[PDB]
Amino acid sequence: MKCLVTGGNVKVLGKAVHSLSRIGDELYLEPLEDGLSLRTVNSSRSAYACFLFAPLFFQQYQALRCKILMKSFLSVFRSLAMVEKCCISLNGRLVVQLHCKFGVRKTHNLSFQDCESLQAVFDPASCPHMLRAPARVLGEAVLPFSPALAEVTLGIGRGRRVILRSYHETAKAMVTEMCLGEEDFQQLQAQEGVAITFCLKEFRGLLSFAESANLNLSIHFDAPGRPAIFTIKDSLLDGHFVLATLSDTDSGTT
Amino acid sequence: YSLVASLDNVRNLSTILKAIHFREHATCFATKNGIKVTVENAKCVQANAFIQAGIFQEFKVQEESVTFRINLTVLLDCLSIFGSSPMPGTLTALRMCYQGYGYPLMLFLEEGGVVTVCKINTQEPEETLDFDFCSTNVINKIILQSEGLREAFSELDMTSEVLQITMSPDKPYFRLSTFGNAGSSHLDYPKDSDLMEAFHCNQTQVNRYKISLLKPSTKALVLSCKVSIRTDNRGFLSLQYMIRNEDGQICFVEYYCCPDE
Amino acid sequence: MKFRAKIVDGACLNHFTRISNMIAKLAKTCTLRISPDKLNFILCDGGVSMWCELEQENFFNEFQMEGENNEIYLELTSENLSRALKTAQNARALKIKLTNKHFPCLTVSVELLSMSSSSRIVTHDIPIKVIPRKLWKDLQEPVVPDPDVSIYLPVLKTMKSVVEKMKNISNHLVIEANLDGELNLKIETELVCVTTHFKDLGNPPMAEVHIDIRKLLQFLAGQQVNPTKALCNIVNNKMVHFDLLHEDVSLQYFIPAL
């Protein structure tokens, strides 16, 4: 691998890595003919995310897939990239060199475990329900909810308006419900009455990255049980999240 | 009497002490020149804080040299008792008094008319090691700015039980390294850098100090303007910090650390 | 039972949130007394008690309730209310209304305005616990007899900073007050003794107490602004009563000893 990320793109890479942290504990790398693929999976196999980095810099491979501890690769971007250049190569050990200012250089020799790729069965085009809106808007829609809220249900109330409701399994809990109008959305193709329940803490991971980049997020959901598909696309950046949805007898496993 | 030290700005004393606060207790050594508080750990690390009598608005030492060990935590809590967020204009006065031996250390603070009196008992088992760190047997010496080392030590802490410091006139002019679970991270400092003030490396040297012993150095690093990283023949480390008072007068803080075999 | 309130004035709305944030720090679970005239936050047990007087006609624009005995005693978790009012900062209107959809709750509907023509709505269902008339008597305002000493309280900011540092020393604390407006804070351990001396504190119309510093610090923490009335009524026996009246919101705090 040969990467040379500079300018604001460096922080964008960091933000991306941070997002993959709030979903998985292991970072999967995989260079491709179209860009750099950063993937990850939930500990319960009920969540998946992927960031495709089409030439956001100066890419090149061979002269390669691998897997590192997500938290180890995170420490490199936690605050160290607060940095004008970033070189990711291979020696022998994933080498992440940081060309900071004043001449100070920060080289990172990260051990890993060469494995296989992370495939997963999706189909947004086959996903019955659909909606598209600015990330900034969705970020505001989740504010009323507690940061510790685990599960939230996305539903469609009568009147073509989306509704986020807190989910819980005589110490009754407070049920928060945010209601948004159809005018807040750039697209709303969902049947009234249909509602799914997924992980909020994970959904925030993507939403936080889509906001800082000022981009639009689109959600594709079906029936209670089948995973929900979240998608975001930029001029030279690509990413998509996939979370599990609760059902009747099962406990949200996919 | 035996020892009296008035001070119009307690921070001239409390601030520099905080840079040496990596242990519960500390040893005080006061002469005619001023006061000297020392804190050591594992008998492998020692931080020295010196405050010349010039800083005080009224210093006084009776007869010979007076010494006494004391709780640094309690002392610092007492000094900054009127809160640690005074705005430009408000100051707390201090009057320190210690009567030789068997007597508690007396503190007298005041702000806006509010006066507080503290009575901290002195407890002197002592037993303090003497680092023979002399300048005559110094191999390498470097003097860089404190801002650059901020992100260094801060994000330095790892699962690595050591911090490798290498100074050389060749390629790696000044490299800090760690080796933990994650792997190995290196931090270089090229010569001819604006962050580099002085550079006197005679020969390449590689030393490893238990990182858990140099972490507390940040308390002085983020509090100083310049830092003189020095290393002698035995391998011992010497961190000298320049801490300027809120009056302008400069003060010193020195860290010593033994290598790791 | 009926209850429908509504806030529109920005100043009042935000100020109302401040009150919730305060009580959330003084009590995990509190009691909300709904009267046609005023609202109250009550609690009694460490045997600390809190009484918060609040003039309803000074916050809401529309207000109405129904008890013969027009009065309602609700038991809710302070945290739930504060979080519910946190989003009502940049809000247009606030409508708190007693509900009972799934179970007795206190719905806090919020209208958030934005660049969008469609109005944003956030509803919170705060679980409520209606208290029977039987305990109505045990939730009345605490009695303030004859204070042995009634001195004016120093700037809470300074008193707080001192208490903070003293907590790191001992859990006990002795508060003394004289006649010439001399308030003293004394902590004593078998190693360190610290005494703070305040003076010139009026008290127009000596007493020591041995309360724990941990609970004294809680009272000073809730206050983010200097009250327009700070009284420290002390009974040499075992009671310290704090009487605050910032603006039109009254706050009574009681701290026993031993």
Given the structure tokens 């127009």, which residue do they identify? Answer: C204
Find out whether A53 and A35 touch, Cβ atoms under 8 Å: yes
Lateral strand order in the sheet of B205-209 = A2-6, A85-90, A94-99, A105-110, B183-188, B174-179, B163-167, B205-209
User: Of B44, B97, B83, nearest to B213 (Cα)?
Assistant: B44
Across the interface, whether the CB atoms of B82 and C200 are under 8 A apart is answered no
Rounded-to-integer distance, Cα B254 and Cα C6, Å: 63
Identify the CA nearest to A135 among candidates A204, A220, A56: A204
Rg, Å, chain C Cα set:
20
C19 Cβ neighbours under 8 A, 6+ residues apart = C41, C52, C54, C249
Please tell me whether residue A136 adopts helix, strand or coil conformation.
helix
| Angle, alpha carbons C122-C125-C129 (nearest 5°) | 155
3-state secondary structure chain B: CCEEEEECCCHHHHHHHHCCCCCCEEEEEECCCEEEEEEEECCCEEEEEEEECCCCCEEEECCCCEEEEEEHHHHHHHHCCCCCCCCCCCCCEEEEECCCCCCCEEEEEEECCEEEEEEECCCCCCCCCCCCCCCCCEEEEEEEEHHHHHHHHHCCCCCCCCEEEEECCCCCCEEEEEECCCEEEEEECCCCCCCEEEEEECCCEEEEECHHHCHHHHHHHCCCCEEEEEEECCCCEEEEEEEECCCCCEEEEEEEECCCC
CA C14 to each of CA B215, C22, C101, C108: distance values in angstroms, whole numbers, following the listed order: 44, 13, 28, 15
Cα–Cα distances in angstroms (integers) from residue C109 to residues C15, C30, C84, C94, C255, in the given order: 18, 21, 9, 6, 36
Query: What distance in Å separates the CA atoms of residue A22 and residue A206, rounded to the nearest whole number?
Result: 9
Beta-carbon count within 10 A of C27 CB: 22
Chain C residues within 8 A of A185 when measuring between CB atoms: none
User: Nearest CA of chain C to the CA of A155: how many Å?
Assistant: 15
Cβ contact (<8 Å) for A178 and C120? yes
Dihedral angle of Cα A240, A245, A250, A251, to the nearest 10 degrees:
80
Instruction: Pick the closest to residue A51 from A66, A38, A33, A64 (CA basis).
Output: A38
User: With helix as H, strand as E and coil as C, how does C217-233 read?
Assistant: HHHHHHCCCCCCCEEEE
Fill in the amino acid letter for A116.
E
Which residue is it, tokens 């238990």?
Answer: B210
Q: Do B115 and C197 touch (CB under 8 A)?
A: yes
Alpha-carbon gap, residue A145 to A197, rounded angstroms: 14
Residue B222: both structure tokens together: 């983020």
B154 CB neighbours in chain A (<8 A) are 79
Whether B24 has its CB under 8 Å from any CB of chain A: the answer is no
Chain C residues with CB under 8 Å of B113 CB are 199-200
Q: Domains plus CATH for chain A?
A: 1-254 (3.70.10.10)
Four-CA torsion B214, B216, B217, B221, nearest 10 degrees: 140
Domain ranges of chain B: 1-261
* Facing B193 at nearest CB: one of A79, A103, A111: A103
DSSP state of C169: T
Question: CB-based contacts of C190: which residues, under 8 Å, 6+ apart?
Answer: none
Q: Is B135 exposed, middle or buried (0-12, 13-18, 19+ CB in 10 A)?
A: exposed
> CATH: 3.40.50.150, 3.70.10.10, 3.40.50.11890, 3.40.50.1820. Which one for B1-261?
3.70.10.10
Site of tokens 């598209």: A132
CA distance A6 to A159: 47
Q: Which of C119, C124, C127 sits opposite A172 (nearest CB)?
A: C127
* DSSP β-bridge partners for residue A30: A37
**Helix intervals (H) in chain C:** 10-26, 78-86, 156-167, 213-222
Distance from CA of C183 to the nearest CA of B (A): 10
How was this one solved?
Answer: X-ray
The answer to whether A176 contacts C121, with C-beta atoms less than 8 Å apart, is no
Q: Which helix (H) or strand (E) holds A162?
A: strand A161-166
Which CATH code for domain C1-258?
A: 3.70.10.10
Answer for the pair C171, C212: CB distance below 8 angstroms, yes or no: yes
Residues of B in contact with A106 (CB under 8 A): 185-188
Contacts of C among chains (3+ CB pairs under 8 A): A, B
Chain C residues with CB-CB distance to A168 below 8 A: none
Any idea how long chain B is?
Answer: 261
Decide if C195 touches B, using CB distance below 8 A.
yes
Q: Which of C103, C118, C126 sits opposite A182 (nearest CB)?
A: C118
Q: What is the resolution of this structure in A?
A: 2.9
CA C106 to chain centre: 20
- How many angstroms separate the CA atoms of B60 and B67, rounded? 14
Q: Which of A78, A104, A110 sits opposite B183 (nearest CB)?
A: A110
Spatial CB neighbours of C160, under 8 Å, sequence gap ≥ 6:
B83, C217, C220, C221, C223
End-to-end Cα spacing for chain A: 33
